[PDB]
Amino acid sequence: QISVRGLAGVENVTELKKNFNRHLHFTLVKDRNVATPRDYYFALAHTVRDHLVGRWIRTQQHYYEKDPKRIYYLSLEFYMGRTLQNTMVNLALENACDEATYQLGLDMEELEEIEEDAGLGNGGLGRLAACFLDSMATLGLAAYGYGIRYEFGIFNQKICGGWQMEEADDWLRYGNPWEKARPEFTLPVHFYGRVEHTSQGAKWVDTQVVLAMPYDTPVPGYRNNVVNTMRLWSAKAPNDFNLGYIQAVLDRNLAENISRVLYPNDNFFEGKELRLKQEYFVVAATLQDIIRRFKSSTNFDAFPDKVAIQLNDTHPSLAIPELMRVLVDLERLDWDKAWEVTVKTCAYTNHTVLPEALERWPVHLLETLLPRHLQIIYEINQRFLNRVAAAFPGDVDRLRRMSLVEEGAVKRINMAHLCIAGSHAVNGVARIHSEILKKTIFKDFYELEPHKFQNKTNGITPRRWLVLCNPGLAEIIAERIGEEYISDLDQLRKLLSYVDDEAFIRDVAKVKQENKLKFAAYLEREYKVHINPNSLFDVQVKRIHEYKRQLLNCLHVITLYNRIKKEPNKFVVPRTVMIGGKAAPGYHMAKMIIKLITAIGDVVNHDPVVGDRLRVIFLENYRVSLAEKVIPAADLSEQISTAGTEASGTGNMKFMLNGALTIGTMDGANVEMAEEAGEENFFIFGMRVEDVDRLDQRGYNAQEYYDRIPELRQIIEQLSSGFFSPKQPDLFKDIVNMLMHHDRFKVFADYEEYVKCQERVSALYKNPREWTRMVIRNIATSGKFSSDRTIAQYAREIWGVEPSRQRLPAP
Amino acid sequence: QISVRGLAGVENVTELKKNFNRHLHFTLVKDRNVATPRDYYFALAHTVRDHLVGRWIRTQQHYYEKDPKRIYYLSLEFYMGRTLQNTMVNLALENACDEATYQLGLDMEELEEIEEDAGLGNGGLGRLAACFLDSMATLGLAAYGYGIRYEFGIFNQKICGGWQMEEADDWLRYGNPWEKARPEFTLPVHFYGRVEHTSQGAKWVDTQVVLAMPYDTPVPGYRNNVVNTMRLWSAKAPNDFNLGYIQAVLDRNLAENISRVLYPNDNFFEGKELRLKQEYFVVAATLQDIIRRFKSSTNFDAFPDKVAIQLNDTHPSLAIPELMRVLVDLERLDWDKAWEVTVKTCAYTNHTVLPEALERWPVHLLETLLPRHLQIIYEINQRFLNRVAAAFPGDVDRLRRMSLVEEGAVKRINMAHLCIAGSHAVNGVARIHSEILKKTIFKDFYELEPHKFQNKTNGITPRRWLVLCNPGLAEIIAERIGEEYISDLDQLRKLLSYVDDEAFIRDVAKVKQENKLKFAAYLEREYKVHINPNSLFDVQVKRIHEYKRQLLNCLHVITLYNRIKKEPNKFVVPRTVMIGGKAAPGYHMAKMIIKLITAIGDVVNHDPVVGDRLRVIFLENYRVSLAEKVIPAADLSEQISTAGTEASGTGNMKFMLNGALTIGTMDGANVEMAEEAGEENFFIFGMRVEDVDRLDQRGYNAQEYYDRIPELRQIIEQLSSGFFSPKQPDLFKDIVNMLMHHDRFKVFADYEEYVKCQERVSALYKNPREWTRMVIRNIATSGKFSSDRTIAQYAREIWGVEPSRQRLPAP
Numbered sequence A, B: 001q002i003s004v005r006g007l008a009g010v011e012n013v014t015e016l017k018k019n020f021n022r023h024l025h026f027t028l029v030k031d032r033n034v035a036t037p038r039d040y041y042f043a044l045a046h047t048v049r050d051h052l053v054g055r056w057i058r059t060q061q062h063y064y065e066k067d068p069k070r071i072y073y074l075s076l077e078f079y080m081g082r083t084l085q086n087t088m089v090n091l092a093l094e095n096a097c098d099e100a101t102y103q104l105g106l107d108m109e110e111l112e113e114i115e116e117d118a119g120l121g122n123g124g125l126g127r128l129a130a131c132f133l134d135s136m137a138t139l140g141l142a143a144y145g146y147g148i149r150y151e152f153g154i155f156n157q158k159i160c161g162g163w164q165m166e167e168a169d170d171w172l173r174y175g176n177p178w179e180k181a182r183p184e185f186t187l188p189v190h191f192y193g194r195v196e197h198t199s200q201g202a203k204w205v206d207t208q209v210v211l212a213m214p215y216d217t218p219v220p221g222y223r224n225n226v227v228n229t230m231r232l233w234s235a236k237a238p239n240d241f242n243l244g245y246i247q248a249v250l251d252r253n254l255a256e257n258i259s260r261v262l263y264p265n266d267n268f269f270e271g272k273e274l275r276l277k278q279e280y281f282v283v284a285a286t287l288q289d290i291i292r293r294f295k296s297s298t299n300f301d302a303f304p305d306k307v308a309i310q311l312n313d314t315h316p317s318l319a320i321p322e323l324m325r326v327l328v329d330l331e332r333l334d335w336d337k338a339w340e341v342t343v344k345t346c347a348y349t350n351h352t353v354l355p356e357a358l359e360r361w362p363v364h365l366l367e368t369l370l371p372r373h374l375q376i377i378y379e380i381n382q383r384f385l386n387r388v389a390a391a392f393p394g395d396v397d398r399l400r401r402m403s404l405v406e407e408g409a410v411k412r413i414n415m416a417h418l419c420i421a422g423s424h425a426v427n428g429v430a431r432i433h434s435e436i437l438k439k440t441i442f443k444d445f446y447e448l449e450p451h452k453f454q455n456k457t458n459g460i461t462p463r464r465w466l467v468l469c470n471p472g473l474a475e476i477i478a479e480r481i482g483e484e485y486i487s488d489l490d491q492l493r494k495l496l497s498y499v500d501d502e503a504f505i506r507d508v509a510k511v512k513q514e515n516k517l518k519f520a521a522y523l524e525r526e527y528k529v530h531i532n533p534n535s536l537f538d539v540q541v542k543r544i545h546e547y548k549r550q551l552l553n554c555l556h557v558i559t560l561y562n563r564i565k566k567e568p569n570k571f572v573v574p575r576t577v578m579i580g581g582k583a584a585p586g587y588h589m590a591k592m593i594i595k596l597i598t599a600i601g602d603v604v605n606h607d608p609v610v611g612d613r614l615r616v617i618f619l620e621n622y623r624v625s626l627a628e629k630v631i632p633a634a635d636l637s638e639q640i641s642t643a644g645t646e647a648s649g650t651g652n653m654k655f656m657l658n659g660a661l662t663i664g665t666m667d668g669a670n671v672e673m674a675e676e677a678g679e680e681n682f683f684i685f686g687m688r689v690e691d692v693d694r695l696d697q698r699g700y701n702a703q704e705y706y707d708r709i710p711e712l713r714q715i716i717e718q719l720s721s722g723f724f725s726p727k728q729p730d731l732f733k734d735i736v737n738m739l740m741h742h743d744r745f746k747v748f749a750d751y752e753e754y755v756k757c758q759e760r761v762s763a764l765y766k767n768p769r770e771w772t773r774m775v776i777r778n779i780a781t782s783g784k785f786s787s788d789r790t791i792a793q794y795a796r797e798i799w800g801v802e803p804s805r806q807r808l809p810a811p
């Protein structure tokens, strides 16, 4: 149908059809009379999967012969989503499969909807890992993603009576055709025990053993015949485990619980033992695998020349003392040499400055679970603090501030401090964030070792986030500037010469309208909700957090409603306001915010005076597959975090690439997005970081805003009196109390500027031609935000490897 | 190489080779440079498996069109063993695969050794189910085996310091290529809750739900293109299970524990809740599946014309009240009609008369777990006892004896009584056993309903137990009488005309010697034990039980040793005495017997005066795959249970078919084996059932035998003094005490006749020609003991279906 989806050649389609039929018979053990849509999906998945095999074997064989430096990306989260369409895109098989299935009497799009998301992540951090894997393969790097194979990913969200309910995400129920179990490469992991000091070094003895069984998933590069590996570890009990008899067998579950479920808490560090076990489990298994592969290439001087380990946040921070343990205790290297190797191989990426999210493990927990690692951490700290003392003599408070060991009620280990000490590179994820790191929370470390601190602005893959989810837009772009931009997104700048092109303006606007109609139809079929497709699609999708300020959005929505009720016969630009995202199960306030959104919808969506001029919809079960549907349909992207709180954001970049305009604060990557597009083409509002600081010095008093802004007063009175909860008048008292007395994120302070800015958005939307011209200016300058750019920078500036766009020979 | 293994045609071998290479690449994701023997096994398994697919689909399609009466074999155990060779045999692919692998540079026999046994059974009962499945497919019956997919089968046995250690049998570690998961056919099973009585009948409410997910395994018939199904249920938690959040997800394991592990206790009924859950789980899921299939064929009058349910022991006895529950509560049939249907569809097979093994469930357990079923059981009992009262007026003691409800300390339900009441047929498993049932434990029921009671003498499949495990013997037989005997074992009678054939005598003896050399070599390689291949191979392999009298064997072994020590320079026929079998983990005495056997070996095997004239070896980890190795190598089969205790035995039949002579009591099928072969060709000794009864009337006094037999006295003094345990002198005091004071099985009473009979065995072995002639007379009369004969009798006399040897059309 469309050019970017590849060729549908006669021999290719014929071969695909017969292999589809073969799999339906031999693999699924079905025939056409009894086969269901799910069976057809699996037949297609196996057919496409076959095409990865030759490329996967020869890519890994190529790395063995060429022996390049290997990149190991360690993360507790890989938010992969669906794999079928992505695989077809990267292999140039999409049109061929579309034709093959069509001739079989099947709709491929219908089959694609059957696939479960691999939801092995919470949000931004997990999805970054996934985009990074795609970019590393596309850029021909010898890269490996290492994580945990959770049997249950992020929970499925159900909304019941307006409240979030959590349901287990049993994603493996029907099987996962994309993984390959490798039980032959199973490795032991040790827990508990004690440390013995013999004449020749320390010995970690009397340990409990849990086995780590790897599952490998292929990661294809874009049309370059490279297929890299994501290896995820699964926990298995040893066969002599606990070995009355029946109970011993049943107790195997305790060991295997390590890989059972993804921790869904992305707001607050809890310090749970099971989470610590997960973190060590992934680290210990991975490092054995790394060292094994290195020895197959005696002397560890060359280790950093052949290995780079990237730590995605502090979650895999135990890699640092584990590498030291292996080098000192097992390989018998001297401490100083081992430390040199460790620092040169490890690098650390930070994703937040909010203190409550930072990992600070109780010493008593590490003492019991990982006694040797605690000893190593103490020695690292002692040697590090001796360096600080030499550099800043007499500065005793610096010594307490920089210590890896935090004193107090319970002694804790600061894992961020551990990461800085043991890494040659530390990076933030957007320019403003990386600057905040150097100026605030890591200032002491920056003064000691300035050379360690870097910026690597986040990005998104244009394969999933344009070609896959928005083929209409990809096609009209390709018509003008060709196909090269898909792996070189900076070429989008060439679209600036089409900003006054009447045909292109019409085409961009047409694609958006079709996307909106498609999504409006999806909402009616799968959720039975009715929306006006001609309204402005106002979208805020992301995890529910106070700092992300879904509440500020809520205040604007109520303002719009109240203004309509005040002047019903006055014209307003029609809006569909969509808010979606999951709340961490233990995050009370976030759960209350979800309830508020639905409660507003109940009032607004059923007011006859409002009509179809304003709709408020909560998007249930927001996840990667839903993002691929809603983002291409959006007109307005809400990126409204308090300045200095969102490290980068990546949803923002997805919206920019897909033809939405952005209303946002100068926070995270928003700053660089406005810089690229021009501030005139962005709807910037609110306090800058400096303004937040000034307000903090004075002390934030919300009552002042309440007293001075009558429209704000009305809303708070409505919330307090039970206007949005007639049966439970005091339902939202927790929300009001927080806003008035304990609001860390200064919602009221940005209210006036936000409302005014929103008026300017509505004014532009009244002029379709000028709206679209501004959209073109955004799409055309989105190039910087390709994860290909991001990865090239990691490669050159941290890992010491050169990216390559050169094809591997076709199988 | 040999004729019975089929043709190796040029096109067949070429096709097998390319499909092997295809699977190695696309299925295993390996190449020849990195592939291990395990990879090659899996490539071969997938290649052979492909050949089952077409036949499996069309067999099941054939049953849909023809709509025959369906046979449902319900068992908690299916002791399947390995599948690769059996599949090749039944599909006539063995020679073709042997050639294909040879040309690839691989040894197929080496690859076969990699496959794990599917050890989903304890012993005889589980293995009978497996032979029955093979025979039902071979005889073209529309039969389905229904059971549980245990993740852990019967434990692997390790011997450490002479003691049994149990190790988890993680048989699914590398995957099971022979199963097909069918998550689409998942069914709910209910537990706990309460009963509500509404205007229209009873209602079972507030239940806990566990899901039953089916896995299907193909069961190919012998060269008839029939492929039946064994469906095994796996336990899954519902997704809203327990749905702080993390704990709810982790608690899913509790529901899924139902299918975790096979209960290894085959001696004593324990009354554990988890076992009751397993029993209901299999019954509830199976019956839904049965009814679903029946409705697809409103009126249940035809149900018994289209459905037969065979209960393998009382383990699936809950089928009776569950069928009543569905018919009365859900289908709204009147009680009398439902009862008529139930009786006509159900049949029950008993496997032991020993009281301690009989299932008698505490009422309080059923009350909590299955409250509706308890109510139904009470009503069944009340109506049954009303029939007894009418038939035998005034006989109040008969009323208490026949009741399904047993009074006492704790009230219990007798599941055997439930089975008799609710079945149209009740059978024992050998003629003597079926007679004992009518005369003793079920006498009251026989007097009430004589027509219900039948015999069905057990059998073994000649595919696994001759063609597969002893191709040498199969071949020399085929040379004389052709191949028809493999599916018509009665044709073995034709070998009687070769008893004086000098060539045949030589060939039979040659095959046995080759088998003995092969097994002697296996022992050296995998266990490092050395045996004389020229010695008489004296074998007792079966589960360790007091009634099976491994202890009597032990006494003979010590007698032989003592006699050698008495007269060292006197000639004795050299013997290798091999004893093997697992003990139930909680069976103390059985564990002591294993220790005794190894303790005897430690003394005997290291006495220089003995030399190679006597060796005592304990065969570790006895299982189906080991049976296939040891049985063809045996000269003497030990079948020495106390008369009236072994219901049938099936190991006995395996030895007879493979050229061993039998030393045995007149117990179980031994009686019919001696009848078929002639008593002159069997080594029969010891008390008959009548003699045991007479001794019981007098009272058994072991001291009498001790006082009168000096050779017996010596042995007991050796055991007591610490001759076989120098470091722990009183180690065997429990064994001596039992023998002297509390021996239920009268070991001493058969000692003298046993020793004398063993002398007659040694005398015959000194005459190789006459030994082999007697062997020929045994093999030639083993025809009756084919499970094909057994199944034909079940079909005609219980199920009301006609067997068929007619081929289904080739795919």
Ligand SMILES: O=C(NC(=O)c1ccccc1)N[C@@H]1O[C@H](CO)[C@@H](O)[C@H](O)[C@H]1O
Pocket: A049, A050, A052, A053, A177, A178, A179, A180, A181, A217, A218, B026, B027, B028, B029, B042, B174, B175, B176, B177
């Ligand atoms: O799970 C996979 N996955 C793949 O083959 C694969 C191939 C390419 C890309 C991703 C997965 N293969 C599986 O390997 C097992 C064990 O050997 C087989 O029994 C099974 O038939 C096969 O599907």
Ligand SMILES: O=C(NC(=O)c1ccccc1)N[C@@H]1O[C@H](CO)[C@@H](O)[C@H](O)[C@H]1O
Pocket: A122, A123, A124, A125, A126, A128, A265, A266, A267, A351, A352, A357, A429, A458, A646, A647, A648, A649, A650, A668
């Ligand atoms: O998503 C997370 N964090 C988590 O999901 C998380 C998970 C476990 C514990 C704490 C936080 N952080 C997010 O990481 C992305 C990628 O750099 C940024 O764009 C975003 O600003 C940040 O908040």
Ligand SMILES: O=C(NC(=O)c1ccccc1)N[C@@H]1O[C@H](CO)[C@@H](O)[C@H](O)[C@H]1O
Pocket: A026, A027, A028, A029, A042, A174, A175, A176, A177, B049, B050, B052, B053, B177, B178, B179, B180, B181, B217, B218
């Ligand atoms: O497990 C089986 N078994 C069989 O195909 C089979 C065929 C014949 C006989 C026995 C098993 N097939 C499996 O079905 C899953 C889910 O559809 C696939 O992902 C996998 O590749 C395949 O091996």
Ligand SMILES: O=C(NC(=O)c1ccccc1)N[C@@H]1O[C@H](CO)[C@@H](O)[C@H](O)[C@H]1O
Pocket: B122, B123, B124, B125, B126, B128, B265, B266, B267, B351, B352, B357, B429, B458, B646, B647, B648, B649, B650, B668
């Ligand atoms: O094997 C068992 N029983 C068990 O394995 C068992 C299992 C669980 C609970 C009780 C007994 N019984 C055996 O069943 C076979 C087949 O009919 C007979 O030949 C044999 O005589 C009998 O002891």
